[PDB]
Amino acid sequence: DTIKVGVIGTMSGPYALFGKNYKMGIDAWVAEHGNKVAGHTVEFVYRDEVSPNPAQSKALAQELIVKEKVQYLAGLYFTPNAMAVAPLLQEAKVPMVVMNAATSSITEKSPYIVRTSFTMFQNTVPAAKVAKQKGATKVAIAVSDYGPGIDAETAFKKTFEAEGGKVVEAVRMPLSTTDFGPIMQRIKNSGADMIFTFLPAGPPTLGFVKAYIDNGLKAGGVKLMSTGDVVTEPDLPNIGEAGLGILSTYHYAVSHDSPENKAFLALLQKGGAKLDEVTMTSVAAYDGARLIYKMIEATSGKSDPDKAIAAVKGMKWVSPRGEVSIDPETRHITQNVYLREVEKVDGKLINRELETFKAQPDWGLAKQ
């Protein structure tokens, strides 16, 4: 009668907050909705992804399938880890609800993947539109050198150049980069008036932003446009008031002003989470738990991945982030993308949402 769900996330190490947020978001879901579905108890089992390490995530998934007999897998912070698990799913008859990894093609790697996070194209196409609206003419792109960074670079170049913008520099930064000073010097030298950047949220984003400020680019009038990965709320106090004014596009802000988001923050606090630790992976986990409960109801708690996936395709609901749906073609969450600016409101640094771009699909797949 117990159905287990195996959640793989960054539970320890440099990215620990992001995996802790999967547990926070699932705990919030359970605080509201309970742990019973279709006459079964649902139990979430957590395993630690740690870092980009495909073989490790493959092995964790296989252990969860064999030893824990999970009916569903979920989580996956890093793209390469999600890619390692994807080819297992159909033979194992276990769906995977991706709660972060954001490279567009992940959903194409199995019929049994559904994604409740975001894609890089989805958030980057609005960033390029806003860059043009804000008067940028020459942009330097700097992205981490792996799947989602390459998607962000491609999306920004294509969209910005179609708007008449020029990309004057494009740097793919190794994931291991910790000293960002030389990159900042290269950007200065390029004469770009704006930077567009993505790095995975965690130490790389903190380092990049601090170098952008401390090397004087921000005060020198080189504006920063990022995806929201680069300015996650728990790092705003670590950047401090020097981060005021940084622009980003993203599908979720802790400051989102809606009744559903206010209720979600209350549930996070009631499930045991702290507000200044809340990140985007919590909302992807909360919505991913909704989809898992729907799949269990649709299948009466029996393993039947074809019926489970069919039940979530086309589903529409109001998330804490805004109105969302699962596109049946891509199995990716269609959602608003917001333009935000780092602001201080009632003594707190937040990403204030200034503009909405409604109902964005995964632009990386939508024109195929």
Residues that bind Na ion (CB under 5 A): 330
Shortest Cβ 154–Na ion spacing (Å):
17
Q: Which residue lies nearer to Na ion by CB, 89 or 136?
A: 89
Cα dihedral angle (104, 108, 113, 117), rounded to 10 degrees? 10
Shortest Cβ 206–Na ion spacing (Å):
34
Q: Which residue lies nearer to Na ion by CB, 26 or 113?
A: 113
Shortest Cβ 107–Na ion spacing (Å):
6
Cα dihedral angle (231, 283, 154, 126), rounded to 10 degrees? -80
Shortest Cβ 76–Na ion spacing (Å):
18
What is the number of the residue whose Cβ is closest to Na ion? 330
Shortest Cβ 122–Na ion spacing (Å):
14
Tokens of 97: 């609800």
User: Could you tell me which residues come within 8 angstroms of residue 107 by beta carbon, excluding any fewer than 6 positions away?
Assistant: 98, 113, 114, 115, 330, 331, 332, 362, 365
Q: Which residue lies nearer to Na ion by CB, 116 or 330?
A: 330
Residues 199/230, Cβ–Cβ less than 8 Å: yes
Residues 282/288, Cβ–Cβ less than 8 Å: no
Q: Which residue lies nearer to Na ion by CB, 118 or 286?
A: 118
Q: Which residue lies nearer to Na ion by CB, 144 or 330?
A: 330
Q: Which residue lies nearer to Na ion by CB, 299 or 330?
A: 330
Shortest Cβ 365–Na ion spacing (Å):
5
Other C-beta atoms closer than 10 Å to the C-beta of 316 total: 9
Q: Which residue lies nearer to Na ion by CB, 1 or 367?
A: 367
Q: Which residue lies nearer to Na ion by CB, 120 or 350?
A: 120
* 253 phi, psi to nearest 5 deg: -130, 140
* Long-range contacts (CB closer than 8 Å, 24 or more residues apart) made by 174-183: 174/144, 174/145, 175/52, 175/144, 175/145, 175/146, 175/200, 175/204, 177/144, 177/204, 177/207, 178/203, 178/207, 180/207, 180/208, 180/210, 180/211, 180/212, 181/211, 181/215, 183/142, 183/208, 183/211
**CA quadruple 240, 245, 250, 256: dihedral sign:** positive
Shortest Cβ 354–Na ion spacing (Å):
32
Shortest Cβ 156–Na ion spacing (Å):
22
Cα dihedral angle (205, 359, 276, 273), rounded to 10 degrees? -120
